[PDB]
């Protein structure tokens, strides 16, 4: 016999991987006197603290930096992101001034604590960045939106992009004897910048605050210092990071025979979906749910700077015509705040020593992808909508993780 | 001890492969009578021709279409491509016509010959495309520079890539009943578009014609037939097939301290070479050589159309600081000229039946690269001098293959 | 002699990364170091002959 | 040395470039008196290595 063999056109895959050394720092603070309602608009409502420090492992910049992200190609998806952390250890301040209350001593007694699910399953909100307190200044006041990019009122903090990894050879607010500092590529201590707390508000709905204490493990510091307690790692279940692929139009008939309307009764479902809980109550809740489905294919990102944007997508991006959920697991480390030796009479605990725990956290991830093409002269990448992707969108955020689950991200933005 | 572990970030290597089932059809041209100067330049010289058709195993468009090459990253190279073809058989006519000369036959013989090195490593060019001869017709006559990419007198002919691969979805000189074919996506046969020969002139050096038999296999056809005869490959010395990766400016002292000189004692060669032999001469030549030596890093290609651009790019292409040297192979596949029954009376032969073959060649090859960054705000891919590349420029052609060797091949161009 | 060659003498480096200042609450630049200082032990030794 | 907030250029001549810098101390060793002290630097015979 004799077969005349095809043609092939095996278009390899890039598969990279990253990690970077972080050196963070928490504070004690101390058991977060809840402040009330962080926002004029919310007022009535209010936020048991914690310094439950927040790992962002789930921004793109706490693994990769600017050029490394800028540089994948489109459908560049992470496959699988890992942090451990060290609890390199804790330092506590040492009261001179005999001032107040706060009677000096060599003595201390800390203890780590860390937790993982919380954030995204339990009953809580990141909150963070906060405004606050004189000597005895452990606790805070006031709440804010969690900062992971810049935030600015025309002078600006923040950037963790570039806490991370300092200015462009010529911006000026940086680069300096004094401005924006390479850190990570240059060892240096830099703040978990939020700290996680639980919300809740007065009357409608109520019964006091649950317990946190059976959702984070805590140790004696001292005994698990320099040992690392976190290691866990996701694989995001939709991590397409880059604007997708192109599926190309040029097969036939009507499928470009024009660009008209292509449908089919398949009698299989195919459509992304949406639950809007209908609470509505006379003394603690009555709710009511009501499946919304919807479309799909416009892009995923733009600003370019939105590498500083959110990593599993997987409520929006519908990969070709079918579904899916779930929620990218958060986590926590930190020291309970240091109660100060407040002698005799302190029958009320507030007063707090300062204290400081750095924690070391190194983050990796791989994310790859392919760049083939099925058409001749095509230019671009290209697939088929056999895979092509879609997103589903919505007038507000889509899941604003930073305000709290039902276990998917409500599409709303708090406080 | 505890050691902070560092950073790392590993990019990846897409590495492709591609394919691709031509096929090609040859002529028996008839041992050709060989033509005087195919220019009114050289007027003076001749080609010794043969039927050798040329598989252009070394112009990108053999493996790669438009769209795949298009779509290779910046440092992308070759790394290996191979061919490997088949007598899948060859025909020959069949005088009705008495006419003639050439009595009518049912006879055939008929023999295939294949060869490699001669084109570049012995002494010949690979002149090609025609201009020719009335029944008995398979001598041919007009020279011609070889063509590969598109020629045009502003009507055109050719287009190599475009011979396989059609036009785009709305270029009209193409797509149509009646216009430029897909063919290789739909499988078709095309001519092998360029044969090959011995140049020679008249006395500036002399002495014959060297002997091509010693440096060509012949088979009986009908023996090799619908089995493989070739299959050589050739792994470039050099194949960096899209601009290189630019190094970046920023490391320090002098180097970025300013835009200025940075040179340095090194004691080690660095520089590419240079020979010119000084053919000079009264009655058969004298040569004298002399190594010409120069610079390095300016670009790679452009018209972007530059897929029709050759392959091995061994002497001018310069990686980093040092040197090398070497010529891609050449390969050609085709059946001497069946001769005409002619009778009694001839004794010259110069009667030739028309006879066409069709071989089946398969092309392949792999081409990968990297997209590193070496800098956390850069933004292109980026290197380093360590390697960064390096080319050398000249005033005509680099090596104009198209014209015979002396190894490597001269840099000026023939006919 | 009548010859040639290349290569530059390895460099080498020790230290302690800064000790970060206790700055308490408000700090969110980092930018307060306590000073330190690291009494490392160096013996060299060389043949030339 | 607290992670040396960069400098500009420490000269009036290069004027717009910086250090980031390191505390990373450099142990000479390659400076001959890292090794010998003087005498013994100066009592090698010619071409002493």
Redesign the interface.
């Known amino acids: 016999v004799?077969i005349?063999?095809?043609?092939?056109?095996?278009?390899?895959?890039?598969?990279?991987?990253?990690?970077?050394?972080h050196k963070f720092?928490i504070?004690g603070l101390a058991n977060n006197v809840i402040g009330p309602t962080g926002t004029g608009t919310t007022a009535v409502n209010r936020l048991l603290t914690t310094c439950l420090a927040e790992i962002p492992w789930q921004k793109l910049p706490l693994y990769?930096?600017?050029?490394?992200f800028?540089?994948l190609?489109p459908g560049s998806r992470v496959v699988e992101c890992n942090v451990k952390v060290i609890f390199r250890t804790n330092?506590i301040?040492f009261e001179t001034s005999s001032t107040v209350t706060k009677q000096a001593t060599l003595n201390q007694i800390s203890n780590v604590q860390t937790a993982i699910g919380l954030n995204k399953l339990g009953w809580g909100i990141n909150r963070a960045?906060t405004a606050?307190?004189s000597d005895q200044?452990?606790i805070?006041t006031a709440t804010t939106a969690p900062k992971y990019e810049p935030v600015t009122g025309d002078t600006g903090?923040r950037g963790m992009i570039a806490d991370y990894?300092?200015?462009?050879?010529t911006n000026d607010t940086a680069?300096?004897?004094?401005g924006n500092?390479?850190?990570?590529?240059?060892?240096?201590?830099?703040?978990l910048?939020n700290y996680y707390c639980m919300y809740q508000q007065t009357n409608q709905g109520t019964g006091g605050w649950p317990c946190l204490a059976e959702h984070l493990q805590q140790f004696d510091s001292k005994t698990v210092n320099?040992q690392c307690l976190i290691d866990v790692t996701y694989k995001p279940k939709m991590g397409l990071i880059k604007s997708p692929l192109n599926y190309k139009i040029?097969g036939q008939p009507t499928v470009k025979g024009t660009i008209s309307v292509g449908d089919n009764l398949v009698n299989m479902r195919g459509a992304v979906v949406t639950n809007p809980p209908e609470a509505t109550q006379n003394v603690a809740e009555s709710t009511h749910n009501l499946t919304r489905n919807f479309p799909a294919d416009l892009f995923n990102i733009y600003s370019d700077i939105e590498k500083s944007q959110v990593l599993h997508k997987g409520p929006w991006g519908h990969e070709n015509p079918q579904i899916q959920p779930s929620v990218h697991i958060g986590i926590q480390a930190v020291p309970a705040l240091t109660t100060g030796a407040l002698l005799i009479n302190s029958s009320p605990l507030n007063s707090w020593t300062?204290?400081?725990g750095?924690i070391?956290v190194?983050s990796?991830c791989t994310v790859?992808e392919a760049?083939p093409?099925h058409?001749?002269?095509?230019?671009?990448?290209?697939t088929n909508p056999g895979n092509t992707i879609y997103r589903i969108n919505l007038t507000p955020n889509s899941l604003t993780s930073a305000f709290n689950g039902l276990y998917g991200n409500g599409a709303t933005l708090g406080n």
């Open positions: 004799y005349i063999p095809r043609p092939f056109s095996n278009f390899g895959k890039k598969l990279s991987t990253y990690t970077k050394s720092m504070f990769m930096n600017q050029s490394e800028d540089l190609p330092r301040a960045f606050f307190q200044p452990m805070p903090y990894y300092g200015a462009d050879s680069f300096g004897n004094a500092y390479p850190h990570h590529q240059v060892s240096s201590f830099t703040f910048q320099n040029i300062d204290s400081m750095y070391d190194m990796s790859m760049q093409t058409f001749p002269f095509s230019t671009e990448a290209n």
